[PDB]
C-alpha cells in the first residue's frame, strides 16, 4: 500500500464506528416439588 500526497489532501478527517448498545440475558428460576400443592396428594420416600 503506497499513497503519496501533496501539501493538502482530503479524506484525512473521517470517522466511522459501530458501537455496541448493550447486552442482556435472563436467569432461569428453579422450582421445587414440595412447594407445590401436589405434595399433599402423595407421600414421598426414598430407598437408596
Amino acid at each position: 500500500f503506497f499513497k503519496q500526497i501533496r501539501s493538502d489532501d482530503n479524506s484525512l478527517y473521517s470517522a466511522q464506528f459501530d458501537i455496541l448498545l448493550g447486552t442482556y440475558c435472563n436467569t432461569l428460576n428453579f422450582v421445587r416439588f414440595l412447594e407445590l400443592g401436589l405434595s399433599v396428594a402423595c407421600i414421598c420416600t426414598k430407598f437408596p
Binding site: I19, L20, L21, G22
Partner: peptide, 17 residues
C-alpha cells in the same frame, strides 16, 4: 460500549388498576 470488561419529582398524573 463500556470497554471495562476485564474478562425524582412529584407530577400529577392519573393511575388506574
Amino acid at each position: 460500549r463500556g470497554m471495562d470488561d476485564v474478562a425524582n419529582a412529584r407530577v400529577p398524573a392519573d393511575l388506574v388498576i
